[PDB]
Design a binder for this molecule. Structure first.
Ligand code: MER
Length: 300
């Protein structure tokens, strides 16, 4: 498939087009124990990009791209709506939360499995519920486009590598800023333990959130991990300290010299350590249609 057009001016501001580390004039040096080849630090409320490295460079997202199938689902599917599991859901590769034949799962439960344990089976199930893989990918990429994600083409809902798969640290920032503005999404990613339904002879179990930033970083709102052979380590994390809500995105990193979540902690530290109002660019606003919602009693 042909590559996506590169915009004539970097989206969010001219400064966001460069390689390497971009910071406001006079600012402190960026953390040196970050191995992410691309990253972003941004304000969730104002949309200000505080600092970045190759923010518009194109890289694979791995599992952090799950934000799009999650929001497509939250937007268009009823939370208590029951979805029947299939063997196809269980047949997907990678991490799974136990979605299978003979199982019934609410969209809500699938979303917790999707986001707390990166359940690829939950992703696949939601994709069928969005109308099967072709329709799901069309909706996911429509959502990406309507959020201004002009670097983003999604090959799979789960983040598994596929032809044409691409995103940027900026775009991922766009997607998670939008997602964190939805209380349903916010609640889920902040959730430490969740009762996941069993099925048939399979019993329910307590699902735990895999995200270490959530446990170890004070003020953390949570986040999302990822890794594939092509993407390397990816990570999104956010925190609220004294009303300042910062987000960091990491792409194409490694687990050296410190784990990805700890690299993220340092970038968040760096972000809080920059003066408020600092801005090298902005996360552009979603299409207006994405920011509002469109919705027995007869005389008898
Ligand atoms: C998403 O990236 C893949 C899956 N989701 C998760 C996850 O979020 O942790 C894993 S990646 C897991 C992270 N730590 C491992 C690692 O760093 N190495 C093996 C080097 C892998 C799943 C694989 C989804 C695309 O399948």
């Amino acid at each position: 498939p042909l590559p996506l057009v590169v915009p004539p001016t970097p989206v969010g501001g001219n400064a966001l087009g460069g390689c390497g580390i971009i910071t406001a004039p006079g600012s402190a040096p960026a953390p040196g124990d970050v191995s992410a080849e691309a990253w972003l630090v941004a304000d969730l409320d104002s949309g200000a990009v505080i600092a970045a490295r190759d923010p518009h460079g194109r890289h694979r997202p791995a599992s952090v791209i799950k934000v799009l199938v999650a929001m497509a689902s939250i937007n268009t599917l009823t939370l208590n709506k029951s979805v029947a599991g299939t063997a196809d859901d269980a047949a997907v590769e990678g991490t799974k939360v136990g979605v299978n034949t003979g199982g019934t799962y609410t969209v809500n439960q699938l979303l917790h499995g999707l986001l707390m344990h990166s359940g690829n089976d939950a992703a696949y199930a939601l994709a069928r519920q969005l109308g099967g893989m072709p329709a799901a990918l069309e909706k996911i990429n429509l959502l990406a486009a309507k959020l201004g994600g002009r670097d983003t083409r999604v090959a799979t809902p789960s983040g598994l590598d596929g032809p044409g798969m691409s995103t940027s640290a900026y775009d991922i920032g766009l997607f998670y800023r939008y997602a964190w503005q939805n209380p349903v999404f916010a609640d889920i990613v902040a959730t430490r333990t969740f009762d996941f339904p069993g099925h048939g002879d399979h019993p329910g179990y307590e699902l735990e959130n895999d995200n270490q930033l959530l446990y170890n970083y004070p003020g953390a709102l949570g986040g999302k991990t990822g890794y594939t052979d092509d993407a390397g380590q990816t990570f999104v994390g956010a925190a609220n300290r004294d009303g300042r809500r910062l987000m960091t995105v990491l792409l194409h990193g490694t687990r050296q010299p410190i784990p990805p979540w700890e690299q993220a902690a340092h970038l968040l530290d760096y972000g809080f350590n920059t003066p408020a109002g600092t801005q090298i660019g902005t996360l552009i606003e979603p299409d207006p249609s994405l920011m509002s919602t469109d919705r027995r009693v007869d005389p008898q």
